[PDB]
Design a binder for this molecule. Structure first.
Ligand code: HEM
Ligand code: HEM
Lengths: 137, 137
């Protein structure tokens, strides 16, 4: 991530957190409708993905600070059969959710910044899980 | 880390690696001579500088070396390594890189390495802080 990029995430994350419920519900609704293939891996409905990414983004400059949580989420992901190739589809639906919510405020840069941020955050998950999948055998 | 910093790091690590033995021995030499107080914490230690260079080659995807970072963090926490020790190691590491760069040790290049050591040290410092916390519950 560049500095400017970090800067956009820092300025905008609090507006995303304010509309958290909408982002979360829109994300999951779009995820399951558009990518029916991942439904099987998941009142008990999942709700923490989007806010967890925002929490990561709030600390975009110190991602190691969320390792203790990432480590635990990873155990659950490896247990469910989450693959590296799933990450782009989740990112796509998260970004679409962010876009709908930002509405008019949805500038390109803003979107592109979020696209990058998600990338870096997803990378941490992907590595930690790759490493646990390898540790399993 | 701006891109120019990253470019300097990627271009120069190979020179530093070729000069490994020198950087390593000058680093430990000056570390213990200038900072006798850390001596007790440590058939001699040898891995530090080469490990930072390795982290630097990976500076763009630090998560990839977490499994090493993690295991090193345990040793550091077992040894009583503190966040305030990082700047002193950084100072002696840069002294060594400066010596080996000789004529190529431009200001710009040293500043880049300074920056890079900073980012890498920040990762270890956070991991170890989480491990120190984890020891008390
Ligand atoms: C950076 C991106 C992601 C984040 C931040 C994330 C976050 C989370 C969180 C917080 C949990 C619940 C852990 C708990 O409290 O038990 C979870 C579980 C789960 N995630 Fe993710 N997720 C990410 C990407 C994905 C991907 C790409 C998929 C692939 C479909 C996925 C599938 C699941 C599944 C199947 C569960 C388990 C539900 C359960 O039984 O708890 N996640 N995720
Ligand atoms: C980013 C900076 C650092 C890196 C990459 C690093 C790397 C390492 C490595 C690779 C080991 C050996 C682990 C093994 O094979 O068991 C080690 C051990 C240790 N490091 Fe560091 N270290 C760093 C900073 C520091 C600092 C700031 C201090 C404090 C003076 C320090 C003190 C030690 C000590 C006392 C040990 C244990 C001696 C031993 O290995 O038996 N390190 N470190």
């Amino acid at each position: 991530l560049d500095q400017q990029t970090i800067n956009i995430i820092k300025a905008t994350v609090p507006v995303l957190k304010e509309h958290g419920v909408t982002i979360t519900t829109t994300f999951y609704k779009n995820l399951f409708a558009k990518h029916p293939e991942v439904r099987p891996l998941f009142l008990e409905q999942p709700k923490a993905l989007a806010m967890t990414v925002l929490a990561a983004a709030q600390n975009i400059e110190n991602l190691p600070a969320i390792l203790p949580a990432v480590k635990k989420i990873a155990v659950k992901h490896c247990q469910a059969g989450v693959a590296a190739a799933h990450y782009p589809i989740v990112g796509q639906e998260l970004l679409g959710a962010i876009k709908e919510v930002l509405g008019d405020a949805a500038t390109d840069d803003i979107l592109d910044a979020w696209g990058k941020a998600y990338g870096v955050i997803a990378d941490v998950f992907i590595q930690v899980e790759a490493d646990l999948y390898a540790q399993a055998v």
